[PDB]
């Protein structure tokens, strides 16, 4: 019920499909604003620090390799209930489970290459935004 900010990443698979515009438009048409944005190529160090909470998760090694395999677009989205709204529009992490009409349903091929990242909580949103943006840039 508040005006929140959350992090979105358009992963290397969506960039290669050239669906950055369609995905950004999904957020803009659904009550969110892109208030910060840059295209970049993550180093391994960047990717391991960003996903440090998952270092012992079994998907870690494959996750890092995929996330440095090509450039991404990182964005801060702003709007009412932004953290929850972003997750609703992305759909289930796994495209095979995502509801029709979500980003992962529309643009993702596998759970390993599932088009977008979004912060899963308000606490993670704070750290993830701060990882990519100095506060003067927002």
Layout: helices, strands, pairs:
Blueprint: E1 3-10, H1 12-16, H2 20-28, E2 33-40, H3 44-50, H4 60-67, E3 72-80, H5 82-90, H6 103-107, E4 116-118, H7 122-132
Antiparallel strand pairs: 1-3, 1-4, 2-3
Question: How would you describe the overall organization of this protein?
Answer:
One of its GO terms (biological process) is UTP biosynthetic process. Its main location: cytoplasm. It catalyses: a 2'-deoxyribonucleoside 5'-diphosphate + ATP = a 2'-deoxyribonucleoside 5'-triphosphate + ADP; a ribonucleoside 5'-diphosphate + ATP = a ribonucleoside 5'-triphosphate + ADP. 39% of the residues lie in helices and 20% in strands. The chain is α+β, with helices and mostly antiparallel strands and 138 residues long. It has a single domain, classed as Nucleoside diphosphate kinase-like domain (Alpha-Beta Plaits, 2-Layer Sandwich). The chain has 7 helices and 4 strands; from the N terminus they run E-H-H-E-H-H-E-H-H-E-H.
